[PDB]
A paper describes a structure:
3FTxs, non-enzymatic snake venom proteins, are the most abundant toxins found in elapid (cobras, kraits, mambas and sea snakes) and colubrid venoms. Structurally, all 3FTxs have a stable fold with three β-stranded loops extending from a central core containing all four conserved disulphide bridges, resembling the three fingers of a hand, and hence their common name. Despite overall similar fold, 3FTxs recognize a broad range of distinct molecular targets resulting in diverse biological activities. In continuation of our efforts to understand the relationship between the structure and function of 3FTxs, we isolated, purified and determined the complete amino acid sequence and the crystal structure of a new three-finger toxin (hemachatoxin) from H. haemachatus (Ringhals cobra) venom at 2.43 Å resolution.
There were two hemachatoxin molecules in an asymmetric unit with each molecule consisting of residues from Leu1 to Asn61. Each monomer of the asymmetric unit consists of 6 anti-parallel β-strands (β2↓β1↑β4↓β3↑β6↓β5↑) that form two β-sheets. The first β-sheet consists of two anti-parallel β-strands, β1 (Lys2-Lys6) and β2 (Phe10-Thr14), while the second contains four anti-parallel strands, β3 (Leu21-Thr26), β4 (Ile35-Thr40), β5 (Ala42-Ser47) and β6 (Lys51-Asn56). The fold of hemachatoxin is maintained by four disulfide bonds, and these cysteines are strictly conserved among the 3FTxs. The electrostatic surface representation shows that loops I and II are predominantly charged residues, whereas loop III is highly hydrophobic in nature. ESI-MS, Edman degradation and crystal structure data indicates that hemachatoxin differs from cytotoxin 1 in two amino acid positions (Leu27Met28 is replaced by Met27Leu28) and hence are isoforms. Hemachatoxin shows highest similarity to P-type cardiotoxins. Similar to these P-type cardiotoxins, hemachatoxin has the conserved Pro31 and cytolytic site. The three-dimensional structure is similar to P-type cardiotoxins (RMSD values, 0.8 to 2.1 Å for 58 to 60 Cα atoms; Z score values, 12.2 to 9.8). Nonetheless this analysis suggests that loop II is flexible and may remain flexible until its interaction with membrane phospholipids.
Residue numbers in the entry:
A (entry chain A), B (entry chain B): 1 to 61
């Protein structure tokens, strides 16, 4: 799997064994700006301030 | 281990087996506001926009 791993566009990495999900964190009030992206094994939980998208195709985050 | 797990004060949970670190995410420009907190096994990486503290004593985050 390959995921975007920076908050600028395009850049990516191949995920390590065990992490088969891409994730994207955004501020709930600003959905257009990724604040943190990368690979993960289990999808991180959202908070009152942060939304977390998880997806499992290449560069889907 | 017990960690703060919300961005309001006080609230906490006991970490599941395998997660022996507390973490706190902040926006690099706003260190005073936690945007996401909880338990983790390996300390999450920082990004250009987000700082991540990790610590291993009770409610240290």
């Amino acid at each position: 799997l390959k995921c975007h791993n920076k908050l600028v566009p395009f850049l990516s990495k191949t995920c390590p064994e065990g992490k088969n999900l891409c994730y994207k964190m955004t501020l709930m009030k600003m959905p257009k700006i990724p604040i943190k992206r990368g690979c993960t094994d289990a999808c991180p939980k959202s908070s009152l301030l942060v939304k977390v998208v998880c997806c499992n195709k290449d560069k889907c985050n």
